[PDB]
Amino acid sequence: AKKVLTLEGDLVLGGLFPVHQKGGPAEDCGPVNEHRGIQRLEAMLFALDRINRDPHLLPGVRLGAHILDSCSKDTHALEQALDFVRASLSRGADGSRHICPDGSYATHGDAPTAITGVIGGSYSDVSIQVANLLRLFQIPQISYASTSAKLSDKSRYDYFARTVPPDFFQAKAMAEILRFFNWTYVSTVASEGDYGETGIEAFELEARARNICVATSEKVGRAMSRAAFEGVVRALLQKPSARVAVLFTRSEDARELLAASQRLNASFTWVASDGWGALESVVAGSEGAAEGAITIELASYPISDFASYFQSLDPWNNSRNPWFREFWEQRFRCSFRQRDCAAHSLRAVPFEQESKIMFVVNAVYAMAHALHNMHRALCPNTTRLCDAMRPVNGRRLYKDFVLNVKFDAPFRPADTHNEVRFDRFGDGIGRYNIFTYLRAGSGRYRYQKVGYWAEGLTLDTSLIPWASPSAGPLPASRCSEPCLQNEVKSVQPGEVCCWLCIPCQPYEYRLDEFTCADCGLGYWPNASLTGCFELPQEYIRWGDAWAVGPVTIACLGALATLFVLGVFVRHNATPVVKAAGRELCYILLGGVFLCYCMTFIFIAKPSTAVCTLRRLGLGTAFSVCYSALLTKTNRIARASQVAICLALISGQLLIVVAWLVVEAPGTGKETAPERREVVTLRCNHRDASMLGSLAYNVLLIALCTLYAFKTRKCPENFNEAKFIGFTMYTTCIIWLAFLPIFYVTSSDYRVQTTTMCVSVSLSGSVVLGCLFAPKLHII
Amino acid sequence: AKKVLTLEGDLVLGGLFPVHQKGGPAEDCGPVNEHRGIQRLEAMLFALDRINRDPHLLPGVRLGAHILDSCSKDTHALEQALDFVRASLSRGADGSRHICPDGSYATHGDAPTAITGVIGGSYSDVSIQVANLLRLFQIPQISYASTSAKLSDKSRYDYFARTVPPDFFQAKAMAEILRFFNWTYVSTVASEGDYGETGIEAFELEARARNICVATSEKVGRAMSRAAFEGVVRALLQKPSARVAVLFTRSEDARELLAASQRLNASFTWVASDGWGALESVVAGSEGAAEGAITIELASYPISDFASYFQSLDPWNNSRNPWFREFWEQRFRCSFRQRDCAAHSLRAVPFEQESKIMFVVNAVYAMAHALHNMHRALCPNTTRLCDAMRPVNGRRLYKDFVLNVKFDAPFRPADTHNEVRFDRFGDGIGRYNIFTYLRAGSGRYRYQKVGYWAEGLTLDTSLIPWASPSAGPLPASRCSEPCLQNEVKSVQPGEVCCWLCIPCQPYEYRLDEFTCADCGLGYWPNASLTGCFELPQEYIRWGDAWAVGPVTIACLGALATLFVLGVFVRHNATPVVKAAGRELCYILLGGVFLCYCMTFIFIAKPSTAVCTLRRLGLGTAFSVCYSALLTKTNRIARASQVAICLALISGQLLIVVAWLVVEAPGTGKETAPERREVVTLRCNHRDASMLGSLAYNVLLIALCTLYAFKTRKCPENFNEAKFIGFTMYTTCIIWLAFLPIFYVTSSDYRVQTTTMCVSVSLSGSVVLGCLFAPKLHII
Amino acid sequence: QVQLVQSGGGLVQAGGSLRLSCAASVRFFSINTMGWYRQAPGKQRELVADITSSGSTNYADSGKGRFTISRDNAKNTVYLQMNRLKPEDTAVYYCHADYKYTTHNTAWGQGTQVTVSS
């Protein structure tokens, strides 16, 4: 058999409430629902009683009650609510049934009470399944809990005016919450019907609008088992980066999901829709699995009068509710057959008020106000049941009185001024509150407000444990962690949500959002000033960490050469010194000072505006030996000393003039070689010029050496002449032998200079020995 | 007003057909549907007429008809079919209406005919909206066109047994088609309704099961405009890689989509569901936009009997169809008020039969057979309407006779044996055909069978124009084109569908599916044999592209040295030659032959097991000059020649013994340097030993030269003594000069052979000059 | 979803000035396109004007130059001006709005009859 809550009244008001929750495969509905079913039913009953006892609202007519159960199902809700349309179909079909009794008031002994107004459809799927049958018979409907997105349009569900906001505001609130915590990688769980699909689609829209993506979307059916929920949790666990889980499930649905997650030891931060709410039966038995769970519920406030009415309830006096006795049996785990729980009272047991109690209260009050407006508009003179109340048209009432409700909310707190009204689409005001499952008490668990969304989200992290800085970093769900932007660059694949970052080339720094910036040529990638640094330390090539040894040896040899040359020229009073001219000693002193200047300019001088002077120095160093060899070959060829010195000066002048003419002091240098770790600051102007000048010096030295080689014996000089000739020959030989050494090192700056330094040091040592040979002979 | 199709009969059969297509916001439904509405209505009429005239099927009872219009809408179909449940609810409520006339047969002058069975719901949304109302009153339903996936379960839509396969097989066929053409990047278009959503979800499931992904899924509503369709096509055009477009839309829906695509000059290879079919009105006006479009249709065959009946139809004789007159007006673009199109006939105009026609026909027969089963279940003796047929219960009929139908298909071709039956879930057999919109004729267009899917897809590209090789490559829709796998490797992001490929490191080849293979160590990346190639040409370093000059000059100098030494030793009869011993000539000839062999061996010898011999050869080459210096310092220090030769041989033996002892012929070489373009095949065993032996030999040479330099003047010998002393001195100087460059240039192996050849050539020239000095003196 | 509200109909003389206004409530919906349609009971609908909301607009076959229309997004309203009307303009004109919330649905409005005399 089935139970129907019938309360006699002048104007019977319909009702459809899910007193029984989802049942198993045996019956349509099994265990009774205590939060959604009993509390809302008693709230509707209390609202009806207060309206019937209100002299300012329907003083003459009485509001009846015809309430049915839905079993949290669609087919059962339809077969139950079929009587609502039967009551009108009987009268519609009895139009021609007028023979015996009368014409228009034919009665058959059993006339169902006409349902002018009806509220119910707490579930979205139940609401859409019953709204069609209601509009087929011109019966208006007002909901209190269904927030389906497909119920906003008036083309299909024309006779539907809920007192709750649709799923759009809820999805916006979920998106704003997920963006507030920087949650990017998201996993969603849905339910089969309308509510789950519409909520999930709206959530994906808002997420893509907020630069948020979802990898996989899960769904659940109606007939479910713990195995399917465990499989859903396992599939969610396939991606470890999906720390967050968006839910659009129901109360028992989320309860079974939490149970399955706890059975598998799965840790998740749970964000859900209004299906979760502030209920305790959903989290019962899964306290650990629901730790740190964000829940969004519709705007609501507790009612003291409804709480007082609910606490003072007993199955004996409350004989009008057929499901109250079995509700007491299920709540107190007793049975009235044994007559044992008669002394139990609800006052001692703590009572939690459903959030949507005010919603159904305001729905009933809006229906009563619409009926009062109808009574005032059709029969304003009389106050009792007027003749115009017999034909009730849903179209006129819905389009002129239901959609035009604007009244102070009953049983509202005196602190705020809440007003119930209907928008253009017959929905409710968009406002939501947020709870977080925390360990507020020692062992007890409860819900604490952590913010609200009303045309804008406002949250506080002080009341959220995991979001507080004391507990550490908040649990974040991202596909890829933010890597080091300094040297790792992220690629932009065909996505907007996820990305992977790999280090770019080491010679380029990361400045742009897509590709590492080059920051130009000759600059080292770093983060010194803005994008990369500049190292001009290449021009300053002092260094000499291991090359200072040969340089110091060369300077010491040059100093010793100066010393011995000074000692020799100071010993000009010797008879052997008087046999030589005064110009050879002077030009040799000039050459020794020249090679001293060479080593000084090669040890410390930079390469900014010295390079051409450096080429001139090489030319003068070559011209020293050139003039020495010219003097040697001129003395052997034969006033005379003056002619020899003039010829040597002219040769040196021609040499330096040619060296200056062959070179072109232009502009332009190499930017950077293939390798980019070190910049190059070098005389990248004309190397062929200096190479050709050196080749010309070598050629003239070879020619003068071949001119001196014709006379191997000098009768005008003693045994020192052959020594001088051998010294000249061996200097030419070592020069021609070290020329390939200078050639093979033509690949880098740090090596082209040490070979030249060694060469000039060897030349200086050779000149020192040549000058010391007569000194050693006269020693 | 509304039109009702009423045909008198003993047992009336309900029907709901969408004669009118979707209308505008003004009325519920506007223009009439030709292929979907009129053809199927006349098919049902023909089926009923043939069954009523069939003696083997319901000979006694006559099958009536109560057919209504749905206007392609849910609310309109519901308010129309409300009479189906009114006919039963009146009798149900008249149970207590028994005072005057009688107890159980109370009549009121207007008794609606009870609808024992009803067929209809061509649209999935209309089907699900009417199935609930039908099962609420125990009325079985049999569909003919709705293939929604949510109608398979019997928990919600228990009283629903369609004659068509569900969306599962359709999605399977779509996935197989898209996989056959290697289509990976896919875009889908849906509609606001159960059919579109379930079809899209099933398609995404089968695509993820076939490694196929979809970027964006578009949906459309019921009330649509050309602007919204243009916006949908524009959003589809936002991704150029989306060449393919999956459609789960309706007939007029796809028509407006094609119109919008043609207006925007958008080219797509349209693949659609059974909503498109072989209709001509959908492609009318959009021939270019529908070119090369794949369409899937439910498997069926044309009926010759129904075609003749449909062609022989006129509004005058067909007075039982209220919509036939307006259908004639809409088809012939005339009006019956003017009385102008009375002479028009349907025979002249070509008639195209809807593919699903036979379907509903079969359905009718199925229902009739169910009725026949009733005649064999309650009253098998009598033939006419028995008293047991008055109460008709849908549960027993549906669970015992409707689901147990198995009969030869009526009007089936004689070639095949098609049998209509109901499966376990009350669905149809899964079989589909494929059409392709092609220009088969000169200017006309038609649909041609290009394959079929029946537990497996079979297609032929000969009948497909774009898939044929004559037209070129088929239009493929992929996010990323297949790049060159030879040197470009693809990264694996958090996806399975799309990827991007970049060139990996040049020194590694791509062999694996994730990362380029390393090709080991010392192997060049290529694709020669299996994965890469090996270049063993490092050991064979003959080369001499530009170094042939110096080595050829060295060989020429060595040959000239051999020649002059032979000419000198052949001239021993001279008195100057008799003044010197014969051992010096022999050891000098041996040394010159040795250096010639070193010159000849530095280019042709390999580096496998020749490095130790080369080290011993350099040792002996230096020991030549060592013995020369030893005999020079021994002759000047003072039988004697024998002692000098013995001392020189002992010194050379000690030198080579030390050189062999310091080196260790072990195993182990360098794998590869930092640069990987070329491999190194070098004697990377011991070079420190080589340089240490060279340093020790240089030290002993320096000690011997320092000992010999004391006796610079040799009165025993003539002017050749000072000449050979100076030669030894300059050779020592050039050796100590070449020592640092030799120690430094060891980094480059290619320069090693060049500098070694230069050094040995210089030494050979020095010895040649030293030996030719006495020859030049005696010349 | 949303709905459209129209105003400014009635009976006008042939060749006179007629202006129709069509508005709606945005409700945070990204309105991409709005236009106008004309149809008759039992017949098909034909577009007469449409605005792409990017400065580009499209018209009907008989409205190349005339039948100018303008939309303001401050109130999301469309206004079309009529100057030359034939007796064939008896059909009711309807306005539509295009919004994209996972549906690409098109919202329509009521019907305001427009009549023209001789």
Next chain:
Amino acid sequence: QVQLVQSGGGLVQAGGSLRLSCAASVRFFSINTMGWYRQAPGKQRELVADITSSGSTNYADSGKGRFTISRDNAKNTVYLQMNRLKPEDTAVYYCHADYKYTTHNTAWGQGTQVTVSS
């Protein structure tokens, strides 16, 4: 979708052995888990058997040792044995199968009543 067919009700004394056999079709649906629940009219169901088609299983708290179950995928069938019978074993046993087609649906079947006497 798929429906489940259960059989093997029987009527035996306490302590005897009995077999419950439940089968179903495949329809290219990969069945995730095949299970057995117990439930009485007007009450809440309890889980007594599960087979994940991989060897893993879980029973009730009071039947961890008894109530052996065997599932074969050749015909997609499950068999549950009843060896130790209690007077409280009166609830109806229902077999279910979980299949994942975009919904993670679970399909039940018609259970069989079992009765035990003294």
